[model samples]
Target: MTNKVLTISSYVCSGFVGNRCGMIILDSFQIQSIFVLTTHLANHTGYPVVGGSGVLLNDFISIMDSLEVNHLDKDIEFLVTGYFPSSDLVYETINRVKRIKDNKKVYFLCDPILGDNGKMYTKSEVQDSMKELIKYADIITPNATELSFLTGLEVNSVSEAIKACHILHEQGIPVILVTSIKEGNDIILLCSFKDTLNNKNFTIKIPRIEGDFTGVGDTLTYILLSWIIKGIPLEHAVNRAISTLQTILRNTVGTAEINIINCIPYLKGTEESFTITYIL
Candidate 1:
């Protein structure tokens, strides 16, 4: 029984431009079929990818229309979202997800790629738009700086990152994954989860890789979404994603550049090799 996952976000046509690196990782994992809605044409290597139109709101709506909610009712299982270049697109995407959730079991995995690592790439209007989308997201993957922006905390340390996650969790967001975390001499990847029922808290930490990979966040988000669609539990999913990323980084060591594309072929059957370690 293969699952169909829909992704609503950016599309890069050029070679690995933008966040296409994420999509490439997902493709490598071979998680059924993916329907992508994007505002631009995108690709990592030279593969021709089929996604939504590049036109913004109208295209987004058109894609939804094409999907025909009446048909996808309880079939569309996961909605993965990434950078929204415009406010209208963000709202429309949210509305589409809400509608999908009305009739089906829908889980949202969001990568708030509104900005780069240390600064905001999106304008104030775009930020406002994302605020609306964040309210309904089930899981969010934000880097250290974006986490700070979302939670209004200075995430200069792991403690601050945890605090920031708590702030977002308090707002009803159950799972928050903070990427590209920097501490004393090392970078950290953190996942914070708040159970919906009891509001219990759980956190997982992955030691960060040394080099700066342009679209690593996108890659991580894609892998995480793929794992979730495969029915991998949340904690286990995070473990697999982190372990896979670490292994890729380790393998590409001393190259001065992270060749994630080269590592994709090796990731096909390694999901079960992941080991989970829990934290509070």
Candidate 2:
């Protein structure tokens, strides 16, 4: 099981976002990825409009059929799912996870890419379906808002967030990685785990750059999970992921696009340079 990721995400022809972003970052780590596209589009919906088509349930189902034919399930070290376009599609994906987990120790990471800030860009049915996968996920990455939606718990403050996580932790998911959290005037990334011999909770504080930056979540997931697949310690992996993502974000000014090229040096390995604070 060498850094081989099975990625299910949106595929766009333009720019690096969704699993397209994952493709590049994973390639940097010499990790092979099998992209199972949830939606195919000329460009990401982040653009004002997109020439795209949501992947149908049958098409999505065929991917699993193909995977089974190729016997690729045993070859996967990690399964990363993001931006599911339909409820049925996600539910079918849940079936694949169930079947694969029975045979191998595949780490399933679900980044419930619904929406942000008390609103869902995805439909109600999509939200409803995402809930079913929580029980099967080894790691769940949801923003504070998404977490609130998932567990039906308040997340207005740090303490509230902790309580919210505890509710989901009781549900059998072992790890939760937050993509957005605010402390005072700053925002940070957070990692919470259910490790018996580990601290289990921590925060990576940093200068928040406000604006709609496309694709950072996919990029973050890629680096974070990639390192974990490479057999790095969870704490250091989370720390390194946070630091590396910030470097990519910091170098990109005047644009919502992350300059992946400028930050290429850190893609494989970014030095431990971050203002992250630990949490109890």
Best by the lDDT measure:
2
Model 1 clash count equals 5
lDDT of 2: 0.80
lDDT of 1 by residue, 60-105 (tens): 7877786674554335677788866678887888788788777667
Backbone clashes under 3 angstroms, per model:
5, 0
How large an RMSD does model 2 have? 2.0
TM-score of each: 0.82, 0.93
After superposition, which runs of candidate 2 have C-alpha atoms over 4 Å from their true positions?
A: 1-3, 195-198
Residue-level lDDT of model 2, residues 111-215, one tens digit each, is 898887777878789899998987799999898888989988877766777787888878887888876776787776767766636664877777787655677
